[PDB]
Design an enzyme around this catalytic site. Structure first.
Site, PDB file in Angstrom:
ATOM      1  N   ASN A  31      -1.643  -0.879   5.343  1.00 19.85           N
ATOM      2  CA  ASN A  31      -1.482  -2.024   4.442  1.00 19.85           C
ATOM      3  C   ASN A  31      -2.132  -3.273   5.016  1.00 19.85           C
ATOM      4  O   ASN A  31      -1.933  -3.550   6.214  1.00 19.85           O
ATOM      5  CB  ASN A  31       0.025  -2.290   4.250  1.00 19.85           C
ATOM      6  CG  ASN A  31       0.343  -3.050   3.005  1.00 19.85           C
ATOM      7  OD1 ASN A  31      -0.422  -3.043   2.055  1.00 19.85           O
ATOM      8  ND2 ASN A  31       1.519  -3.706   2.980  1.00 19.85           N
ATOM      9  N   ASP A  96      -1.265   1.479  11.507  1.00 18.39           N
ATOM     10  CA  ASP A  96      -0.231   0.939  10.554  1.00 18.39           C
ATOM     11  C   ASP A  96       0.431   2.094   9.770  1.00 18.39           C
ATOM     12  O   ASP A  96       0.816   3.111  10.368  1.00 18.39           O
ATOM     13  CB  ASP A  96      -0.906  -0.130   9.654  1.00 18.39           C
ATOM     14  CG  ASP A  96       0.060  -0.905   8.759  1.00 18.39           C
ATOM     15  OD1 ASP A  96       0.702  -1.875   9.247  1.00 18.39           O
ATOM     16  OD2 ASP A  96       0.124  -0.598   7.550  1.00 18.39           O
ATOM     17  N   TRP A  97       0.550   1.982   8.455  1.00 21.53           N
ATOM     18  CA  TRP A  97       1.140   3.037   7.646  1.00 21.53           C
ATOM     19  C   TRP A  97       0.385   4.364   7.724  1.00 21.53           C
ATOM     20  O   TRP A  97       0.985   5.405   7.477  1.00 21.53           O
ATOM     21  CB  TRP A  97       1.375   2.623   6.200  1.00 21.53           C
ATOM     22  CG  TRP A  97       2.621   1.823   6.076  1.00 21.53           C
ATOM     23  CD1 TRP A  97       2.731   0.463   5.958  1.00 21.53           C
ATOM     24  CD2 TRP A  97       3.938   2.342   6.043  1.00 21.53           C
ATOM     25  NE1 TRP A  97       4.059   0.109   5.878  1.00 21.53           N
ATOM     26  CE2 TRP A  97       4.821   1.244   5.932  1.00 21.53           C
ATOM     27  CE3 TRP A  97       4.468   3.640   6.126  1.00 21.53           C
ATOM     28  CZ2 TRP A  97       6.202   1.397   5.901  1.00 21.53           C
ATOM     29  CZ3 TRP A  97       5.827   3.798   6.080  1.00 21.53           C
ATOM     30  CH2 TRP A  97       6.694   2.668   5.960  1.00 21.53           C
ATOM     31  N   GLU A 120      -1.133   0.680  16.862  1.00 20.12           N
ATOM     32  CA  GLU A 120      -0.380  -0.256  15.997  1.00 20.12           C
ATOM     33  C   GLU A 120       0.448   0.516  14.968  1.00 20.12           C
ATOM     34  O   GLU A 120       0.341   0.331  13.752  1.00 20.12           O
ATOM     35  CB  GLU A 120      -1.319  -1.311  15.378  1.00 20.12           C
ATOM     36  CG  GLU A 120      -1.645  -2.428  16.404  1.00 20.12           C
ATOM     37  CD  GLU A 120      -0.442  -3.296  16.717  1.00 20.12           C
ATOM     38  OE1 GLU A 120       0.134  -3.767  15.723  1.00 20.12           O
ATOM     39  OE2 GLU A 120      -0.125  -3.528  17.924  1.00 20.12           O
ATOM     40  N   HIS A 273      -3.031  -6.960  15.207  1.00 19.52           N
ATOM     41  CA  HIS A 273      -2.606  -5.767  14.456  1.00 19.52           C
ATOM     42  C   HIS A 273      -3.772  -4.909  13.971  1.00 19.52           C
ATOM     43  O   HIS A 273      -3.734  -3.677  14.121  1.00 19.52           O
ATOM     44  CB  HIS A 273      -1.707  -6.162  13.277  1.00 19.52           C
ATOM     45  CG  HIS A 273      -1.171  -4.975  12.517  1.00 19.52           C
ATOM     46  ND1 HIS A 273      -0.403  -4.005  13.112  1.00 19.52           N
ATOM     47  CD2 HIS A 273      -1.285  -4.617  11.216  1.00 19.52           C
ATOM     48  CE1 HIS A 273      -0.042  -3.111  12.203  1.00 19.52           C
ATOM     49  NE2 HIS A 273      -0.577  -3.455  11.049  1.00 19.52           N
TER      50      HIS A 273
HETATM   51 CL   LIG Z   1       3.792  -3.133   5.494  1.00 14.50          CL
END
Ligand SMILES: [Cl-]
Ligand SMILES: OC[C@H]1O[C@@](CO)(O[C@H]2O[C@H](CO)[C@@H](O)[C@H](O)[C@H]2O)[C@@H](O)[C@@H]1O
Ligand SMILES: OC[C@H]1O[C@@](CO)(O[C@H]2O[C@H](CO)[C@@H](O)[C@H](O)[C@H]2O)[C@@H](O)[C@@H]1O
Ligand SMILES: OC[C@H]1O[C@@](CO)(O[C@H]2O[C@H](CO)[C@@H](O)[C@H](O)[C@H]2O)[C@@H](O)[C@@H]1O
Ligand SMILES: [Cl-]
Lengths: 298, 300
Positions: A31, A96-97, A120, A273
């Site tokens: 995201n 991330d995701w 991350e 990030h």
């Molecule tokens: Cl998120």
């Protein structure tokens, strides 16, 4: 090359490069990004692998079905994409995701995973202190501001206003996690998937899926299970960390890597990030070497 | 991070840089002419997180001793063997460029059980004719390739090489920067000069071009490197070959066919580069090597 696959009555866009007679590497974004974030990494890995980078459903150039866009919706679409492309095993490279998707995939299909390169990443977080966790005195300030923002994202009404109306995830959170300033031409493809409040539904759904303080319970449990599987897995792993990072502090990365078997840890230097945008060449070169090494002896 | 140390070797001494965990696999970094372990300075920090890195200065180079010897290739073989024994290294990855590759190939041919893997670039091979030296298929590279052959023919000529290398210091002042695309900073160039303050100190630098295996001369080296290349072609250990465009000793087109002919060889394309690739591509080389070692050691 950017192609489109029919998936579950909708479609997913994807980027593809490399000789298609080589091991497959699936690159999984989170995201509010898309396969765009891998654009400077793919050319460094394509000499050694068949690189496939999908846009998650409702992201990038993928279809926009009228669905909830919960974590488990993404799971179903990604599984369907992999089936549709005929991929029977792959390395996974994730941020991330994308990491939650990678961990959950590996847990359900250990036979599928040739190796996992990640950064991350998402893990169950018992308290808000564990979100943007760090033991570094100078970082305590930045961490608290992240906590405050995501608390608001997860608040009814407030999250809608911030993400759907004000586009805060694309306009603020994204640049906020890149050390350098993106050129106009680099930022523009991050904006184009999300022209309207409605189009931003998936971007709002994701922070509401983060496994924090027991909620949402289903995702929390799924990711606890996925992390247990990861700690018990025997496939090679490659963890990257930035300084100071965001979800993963350098000191946490060291502990986490040591908690797994066959996990190497690569230090990238100044980063937050969205490490890909600051460290594309280092990531690409690292991943390519690692795949070359594994394939030489597996 | 990185300590510079000294080991007693065959009555003299070799300096070396060392960094990394003493429980990790060893990686031996081998420089060539007219360099030292200085050339690995920006690569070492990128590999040290995954490996115990050891980068010696060849005898007569860098901060190593300067014994009264001929500095032939076989002299380097003896001193490097002795260094390895003195540090008590029983197996290692090899990372090599230039005459470092000749040493690595010769070591691997004699002791293949010692080689965990070989990462190499801009390497030496037997060259049946002068046209195989700086070989290029490319029309627009032909004059520069010819110039390079003329220079090295002169280095190998009695009297001429002495004037060029010992008196004029041409290998350090011209050939070295000549093979780097970027311009080195003063502070980066200075440690390439300090090993070689006098004509006589440059004897090992003049010795090397005269050892290159070209048209059968010198015969002993030519034979040794033919044999070492046969072994390389048959070898089963993992390999990583880096290439620049256009390169110098190794053309992109040659690199592609060479890698494809080997067992377990990956080819990593670096982009614009000449002979001294480390100076233009330290980060790409270091990240690549570190990833590769991590991958291999994850699978055993
Ligand atoms: Cl998120
Ligand atoms: O050793 C290099 C590098 O490999 C990793 C996994 O990628 O660890 C492997 O090798 C270690 C040293 O021999 C072992 O201790 C470990 O069990 C094995 O997985 C990295 O952790 C290490 O940096
Ligand atoms: O890749 C480095 C990373 O691997 C870990 C295990 O996850 O440790 C390995 O590498 C260390 C550094 O060389 C070795 O000393 C250690 O024995 C080996 O297991 C992590 O500790 C490290 O961050
Ligand atoms: O496959 C990526 C990369 O690995 C190398 C060795 O480093 O080749 C290995 O993998 C191939 C595909 O699985 C095998 O066919 C080959 O035999 C094995 O050595 C590189 O050549 C390749 O680019
Ligand atoms: Cl030479």
């Amino acid at each position: 090359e950017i192609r489109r696959a029919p998936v579950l009555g909708s479609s997913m866009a994807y980027r593809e490069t490399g000789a298609q007679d080589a091991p497959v590497v699936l690159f999984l974004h989170g995201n509010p990004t898309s396969s765009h974030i891998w654009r400077n990494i793919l050319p460094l890995v394509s000499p050694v692998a068949h690189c496939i980078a999908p846009d998650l459903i409702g992201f990038g150039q993928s279809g926009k079905p009228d669905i909830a866009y919960r974590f488990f919706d993404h799971v179903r679409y990604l599984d369907a994409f992999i089936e549709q492309r005929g991929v029977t095993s792959a390395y996974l490279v994730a941020q991330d995701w994308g990491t939650a998707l990678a961990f959950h995939l590996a847990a359900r299909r250990p036979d599928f995973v040739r190796g996992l390169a990640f950064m991350e990443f998402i893990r169950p977080m018992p308290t808000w202190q564990d979100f943007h966790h760090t033991e570094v005195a100078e970082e305590q300030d930045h961490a608290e501001a992240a906590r405050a923002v995501f608390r608001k994202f997860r608040t009814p009404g407030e999250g809608e206003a911030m993400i759907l109306e004000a586009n805060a995830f694309v306009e603020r959170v994204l640049p906020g996690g890149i050390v350098r300033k993106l050129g106009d031409e680099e930022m523009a493809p991050y904006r184009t998937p999300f022209p309207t409040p409605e189009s931003r539904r998936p971007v709002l759904a994701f922070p509401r899926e983060l496994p924090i303080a027991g909620e949402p319970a289903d995702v929390y449990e799924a990711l606890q299970s996925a992390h247990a599987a990861l700690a018990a897995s025997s496939y090679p792993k490659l963890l990257f960390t930035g300084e100071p990072g965001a979800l993963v502090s350098p000191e946490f990365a060291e502990r986490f890597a040591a908690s797994l078997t066959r996990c190497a840890l690569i230090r990238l230097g100044a980063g937050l990030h969205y490490l890909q945008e600051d460290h594309a060449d280092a990531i690409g070169r690292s991943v390519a070497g690692w795949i070359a090494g594994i394939e030489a002896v597996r």
